[PDB]
Design a protein around this nucleic acid. Structure first.
Length: 96
DNA sequence: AGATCACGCGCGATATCAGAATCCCGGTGCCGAGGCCGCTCAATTGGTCGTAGACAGCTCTAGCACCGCTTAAACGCACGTACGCGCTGTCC
């Protein structure tokens, strides 16, 4: 509770802080979409964003705040920007 | 080669998907304002006396006015150069 974590949104990562941890067994959260209500999900406030973007995320969309996940986030950002540059270059080439 | 139609790209406008901040509407508790009461000090009433200001007469200084010359300064004109202003790009 309150620890730092990395969360999925699209093909990119975003640093977030856990505000609520949901325990489906006891039906309570320590301080919900049906597809994650059954399992242990977490309410997270994303670093660098407003409270309006706070959301519940399951285990699939979350990762521990470690070196490996930070590096994987950096790789995702790098491949995303590379893809955008490639798409722009392809459009430019198609234009001539 | 030129004109018309269709497709693609670029730009403008509206909408919108949102989400952000502000304004608004309602309930609530408050304390700040308006009011009444009592007391007293400052304003009003009455009177005096004296000097400050109002008024008339006179004086003469200064303001106004006028004229005429002469000549410093304003007005006018022209060339041009350098400063204002617009546009553009970069960096912070």
């Amino acid at each position: 509770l309150g620890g730092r974590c990395l969360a999925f949104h699209g093909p990119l990562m975003y640093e977030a802080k856990i505000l609520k941890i949901w325990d489906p067994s006891s039906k309570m959260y320590t301080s919900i979409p049906e597809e994650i209500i059954n399992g242990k999900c977490f309410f997270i406030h994303y670093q660098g964003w407003k409270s309006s973007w706070d959301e519940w995320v399951g285990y699939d969309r979350i990762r521990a705040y470690n070196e490996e996940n930070i590096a994987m986030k950096k790789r995702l950002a790098n491949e995303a920007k590379e893809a955008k540059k490639s798409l722009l270059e392809q459009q430019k080439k198609k234009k001539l």
